């Protein structure tokens with residue numbers, strides 16, 4: 001029935017927009033409109049009404065109000081966050097279980113001289129008729145008690161729980177209904193990089209938000225077609241895809257996205273900090289991208305220009321796929337015919353080059369080339385070969401050989417991505433599964449207790 005809905009603020013929030021409602025952590029509010037990213041609410045205190053970020057609130061006393069609970073985070077991301085600098089031995093998080101829907105799992109930071117810093121995962125079994133336990137020995141009535149216990153001596157766990165994984169306050173969502181924005185709302189500051197169809201600049205939106213802005217040269221794309229495609233792009237929200245905030249619809253077209261501190265994966269890998277990334281880390285980067293592509297696969301979209309130059313790296317080293325789908329609206333006569341020095345021939349599937357048959361399978365081929373760029377620290381594909389020679393060689397059966405520092409198992413995946421018949425290439429869902437669990441040899445990744 002029309003029951004009043006109440007929520008509690010998970011963080012403080014300062015109004016920056018006109019109809020914004022400011023609140024401090026803990027305050028409770030009534031939900032008036034549940035319009036996606038922003039909700040219209042009412043303060044039980046000042047009785048004032050305004051719009052609030054939907055990700056800043058949650059049901060009262062819900063599980064998301066606890067410091068030790070991490071909602072909607074996968075096993076792999078739980079590992080990446082716990083391993084991030086700032087955490088310590090015993091750092092943990094209780095999260096929703098991916099393996100056993102409805103149940104929970106505990107992730108704990110560990111360490112041994114052989115593997116170094118690692119993250120161990122334990123299944124928390126939910127007993128019918130109340131109860132929680134990792135060990136049928138130490139049972140508890142609530143997750144909080146489970147934490148308090150293991151927070152006092154490991155009692156079997158690989159480690160003694162210390163403190164919750166470090167997390168930074170979620171960034172404010174983009175202004176409500178600010179999809180098509182006036183060019184003057186942006187202040188372009190410094191040039192971040194160039195491109196064949198546009199440049200990328202660092203900028204500030206309405207003096208309050210730092211963003212990256214890609215500027216497309218006039219005539220580089222159909223304005224009407226771009227807009228239609230951008231309306232699909234913006235809906236592809238995932239941790240492994242760069243967020244697309246807004247666009248300026250008049251030429252020169254502007255595509256506003258979140259800013260990624262470490263640039264493209266390509267530049268990052270060729271840099272100093274990049275050269276120091278161990279093979280296991282490079283594989284994890286590959287798994288992250290595959291994860292992003294599996295999302296694109298699920299949503300029936302296509303990247304069309306997948307390559308290391310189009311993967312961005314955040315300050316915490318998280319990969320974000322960029323430019324997905326943009327290639328479809330480029331006008332350039334040569335580019336449209338998959339010809340010329342502007343077209344990504346070396347990364348493109350034979351059927352896409354020959355008949356313009358772009359599908360999620362042509363992206364799989366591209367991912368294979370991307371895998372090679374990654375394992376070689378950004379080296380150019382088919383070194384020394386020209387586009388005509390590559391096209392000819394591939395038709396002959398040629399495939400780039402396996403580099404010295406590239407494990408055979410990783411190379412085998414590349415080879416499957418480069419099958420001439422698109423239907424014989426694996427899905428990104430499969431590729432992600434193989435890369436997420438590429439290591440820790442044997443395993444059923446779920447430390448059993450004890």
Ligand SMILES: Cc1ccc(-c2nn(C(C)(C)C)c3ncnc(N)c23)cc1
Nearest residue numbers: 192193200212214258259260263264322
């Ligand atoms: C639509 C779109 C918009 C911007 C970018 C982008 N390109 N680049 C470079 C190339 C400089 C690394 C970036 N560097 C930091 N942050 C970014 N967001 C970008 C990519 C795609």
